[PDB]
Design a protein around this ligand. Structure first.
Ligand SMILES: Nc1nc2c(ncn2COCCO)c(=O)[nH]1
Ligand SMILES: Nc1nc2c(ncn2COCCO)c(=O)[nH]1
Ligand SMILES: Nc1nc2c(ncn2COCCO)c(=O)[nH]1
Ligand SMILES: Nc1nc2c(ncn2COCCO)c(=O)[nH]1
Ligand SMILES: Nc1nc2c(ncn2COCCO)c(=O)[nH]1
Ligand SMILES: Nc1nc2c(ncn2COCCO)c(=O)[nH]1
Lengths: 231, 231, 231, 231, 231, 231
């Protein structure tokens, strides 16, 4: 594949997809055994190791629809990946979305043109694979991890002068990140299973930051949910 | 309210929403006790009765985004309805969607302009209330009712010369109906809970019809799931 | 046809199209002789009778582009209907549109995506059949029924938070209803003749309601114009 | 006004609007008495004279929405013009539109973005002033001039590689020209009256040309209808 | 060609394109030797003469995308024209654009739908031919003519109630005219070379007019740059 | 700044912007003296060093409009960067674009919605800063580096099932990459100067790859042009 330097069999059936390739490294080293780095192209690291004797890969995606779309397309088309799970963060856009909440996205809205390019007059609603989502939901509930299931907004512009998050929040949308629409659309288009699990890095409308301790905790809950869900 | 002749308190917290007002009548009379018709305006019947001692209303919506939007807006704004559950049918657009399957829609795509009118450049993905959906899912599973969770397409044109259902099917979409986008968007916009449960009336791409017996069976499973889910 | 339970020959060449199927019943029983109900599917009644020895049908359409599109497509495709005449009401959006005025729509604007779905970058202007319109206009003038000829707006959302009726009014548009664009487009696409005759139920911008007596009078003028026009 | 060198009072209440300023000159000199040229700016001639003792102006518009929009805006805003009548030609796009037919446009479709710029998600249907149209229609009928009333298509591209005229024809549209949408929209926006009367210069789909004699005849019928209509 | 009455060979390889056909006449008579008028159709004059022994044509385009598109398409397709140079004016929309500045447009934004008609979801950025632009730039610099290189906005509406020039100015856009997008797109589509050289007729946001002397001077600089660039 | 860990003064006035942060490292180490890495966040390295005694930074952008938009916004807003120069590659889409050619983009087309989000009905044409472009052009010419000046296409989807590059090529567009629209728009919006210099990595329509030696050579020419241009 053009952007991933792996050899056949080096990538697992199940790939976790953080945005930050240094977080991919952190996840692999902290959570998995017998880790190998199968990719260094562009410094977008990918790794494979085991969790409870089961192979799992962790691949950085970069930020934004166009970057994740590259990695997801290649993982699917060249490495026959079956389960793709984004583990990232988002900016919460409602007060009722708590800093400790782990978010499982059922769907995502977007201002990316990717789906209008394919469908024109149709609004395509991307959809999480329900089996992955329900497993993740059960795993959170079992351990008492606070979890909220709803939708997010996949944004093209981190700094958007024409942001509609205020209106999106009133329509129930939970938070804003930069990947989910692409992940969910591309996995579905190829008959694979996808889910995004997100932590809250801040409230964008109040500007209130989540603390370092808060972030470390929710991140560990996200990774546990991601792995527990698939064991 | 302009289109519903009910008096305050006559409509329950929970409303079932068939498209066909003769099916609303059928549901109420067959499933509920102590039934009263609270609405005859336009012959779009609505009824209220009890199921296991709990009040439940059943309101016809008519067909298409514009018609359901009228009834959903009025139910919410004038009657403080909390849970809105569409019980309808759809045309299946994938072979893997079986005629006996009961569909719980996580989200819906659309060619209605309703959300571009509000959001312009944003593709708004509507979202089922997860609590209703999970309850409905558990109730199906408990009894062994075959159930599939995914997305549908809300169409403006039953006869569409420019239909994209072929492409929609390849993106994983399950079937086509005429209401869900509006229900899910309008409920979310007002902080209420919504879910669409759908049976399969045919396969639109093969033209193959589901039999009368098949339809009667799935319809009863849909109504059981709808009611069991909320008891 | 899927939504109309009639047998061949049961529907006349000329069909009147009220939105409310209880008004279809009222029109048939009050104005026609030798009436039969040819349709009860979904309670969307249709009837056929005679006026001055000439067969005339009256078919409810429901509300909104998607609902009328179903009935108009079936009437045309399955019953070879030649003349389709909407008899309905609208909310006036200009002070110069008087509560007693009967409106003959030359064309309609819309926020429905139905025509962008077919044409994309083209704004399709629907067009009344001039022969029907001129006949209706002559019949009004002959009897002194106040009549105004201009355009309307076909709306998808009865409750629209992003309504542009203020701007539409400044561009000369007379009033807002939920059907005309679909009727005019679908009739033209199949070489049939269509016209919408509308009464005024209120002024939407002043909130001022037309009285019951006012409504009964204009409704009778509309039906006379509709029938006189075609005798 | 920026593009018209006339002094107040030099332009009549009623202006005829050919596209070609040499045709404006021809119309004035051939049909009117006591003619003066009130405009030579850009060689887009305008003239004023009398017909049966009544003042009438004739102003070239140039070709395309942007050019006519300039002249129509200035005529209205700076010269208080009340009646604006386009007298031009179009390419017929249906076989049933005969080379001798004089076309009165009730409305026009377009691929110009002018109305999406103002309305976004709304398809604005422009509308002829019915009083002018009916007068023109009566004047044609009185003398036996063959006349057809329907819609046209206002095109931005005379040479359009993505032309949809084939589909437009199937929807009943009569022919294609380059002005009407702008005329009808701008007149309505300012409470003035507008009408387009068009001859047929060819059939665009068959490439068949109308002869010089044919064109001279229909042009004279158009001008008679235009003037008779307003006497 | 439909709109140009010239015979083969009558039009030069290089055509200057003023909007105003009276300015085409002025340019030819003032700057060229051995001038002949090859076109009088619609009074949109075109002329051919020599400058320093080299053939050069000057053709009026009219105003707006649709009008220039006609002339540019015909010049290219029927007369094998290789270099097309717009010499016109624009309304400056930034204070830093000085009344004496001659503008060479690298590209243009637009509210014309011409390119969305061809490309839909793509924003097509038109592009000047760099060789013409650089030659024009060198010729200005050589003589000390003040020159600014950047983009313009091609507008459909001279009187635009929804004008975005304020925002366009903040994005660096220099001024507004009515032709460039069409010229640059159509020349590129056919492998020919195009450039727009523009003077400043006013500042649209301050309403400040450039004087007659100012306009005569910049116009002469524009024509010198246009001709010097191609000798 | 959120994504860049530098301290004030650590980033130069002039920043080179490769997509690949490992190429940023390579450029800095190979071309500059007294290099320091000022950023390791997300492994998106940035470095500052000197070239001929003048400070120059080199910052990885990642791939796609959303990723570069983050880095460009932060460089401008938080580090007062004045000159931003993308040094990257593109897939050539015309045969006349030679593998050795260094491309200077005057403008870029896109299927990103970023500008429709800001402008709606306007097609915004981004524009290179001419001074940077001309300097780069002169520096190439001086040394005999083959150089082509024209436009590119900024794509959201590296794997695009609905790619229009065939049509884009016929309109003169040179090649496809994933950054330029964002760079040019965001720099202009903030009064800074931007340019994209691109090498050719392949011909996308012929699938023909450029060799390793070819790529190493053109890359060195690009970097020389980038640096020579600004000394
Ligand atoms: N677009 C956007 N994404 C955010 C914000 N806060 C956190 N994220 C999610 O990180 C980007 C995912 O790579 C924000 O304000 N805007
Ligand atoms: N649009 C559409 N809806 C369908 C079809 N089959 C079943 N439904 C769902 O019924 C309409 C919901 O009121 C079909 O072919 N098209
Ligand atoms: N959309 C809309 N339609 C109206 C209004 N008032 C009357 N009508 C017309 O009735 C709907 C046609 O079925 C209004 O305020 N909005
Ligand atoms: N766009 C277009 N207009 C035409 C055609 N034939 C005649 N007209 C009308 O003339 C243009 C009005 O100024 C054609 O083929 N296309
Ligand atoms: N659209 C527009 N064009 C202008 C303005 N001022 C000068 N021009 C350029 O003249 C039109 C080109 O034929 C203005 O305010 N608006
Ligand atoms: N979108 C796209 N970009 C390309 C291609 N080839 C090279 N590039 C440019 O690299 C992406 C810039 O980060 C291609 O086929 N498609």
């Amino acid at each position: 594949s053009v952007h991933i330097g792996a050899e056949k069999g080096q990538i697992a059936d199940t790939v976790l997809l953080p945005g930050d390739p240094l977080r991919a490294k952190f996840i692999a080293e902290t959570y998995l055994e017998n880790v190998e780095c199968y990719n260094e192209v562009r410094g977008m690291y990918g790794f494979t190791g085991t969790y409870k004797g089961k192979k799992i890969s962790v691949q950085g995606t970069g930020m934004g629809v166009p970057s994740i779309s590259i990695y997801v397309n290649e993982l699917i088309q060249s490495y026959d990946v079956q389960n793709l799970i984004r583990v990232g963060s988002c900016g919460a856009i409602r007060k009722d979305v708590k800093v400790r909440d782990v978010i499982l996205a059922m769907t995502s809205s977007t201002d990316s043109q990717m789906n209008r390019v394919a469908f024109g007059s149709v609004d395509f609603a991307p959809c999480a694979d329900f089996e992955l989502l329900k497993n993740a939901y059960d795993a959170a509930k079992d351990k008492g991890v606070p979890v909220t299931v709803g939708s997010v907004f996949t944004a093209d512009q981190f700094y958007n002068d024409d942001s509609q998050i205020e209106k999106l929040a009133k329509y129930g949308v939970l938070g804003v990140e930069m990947e989910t629409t692409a992940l969910y659309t591309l996995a579905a288009k190829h008959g694979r299973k996808a889910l995004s699990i997100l932590t809250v890095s801040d409230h964008v409308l109040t500007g209130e930051e989540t603390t370092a301790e808060e972030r470390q905790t929710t991140f560990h809950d996200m990774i546990d949910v991601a792995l527990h869900s698939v064991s």
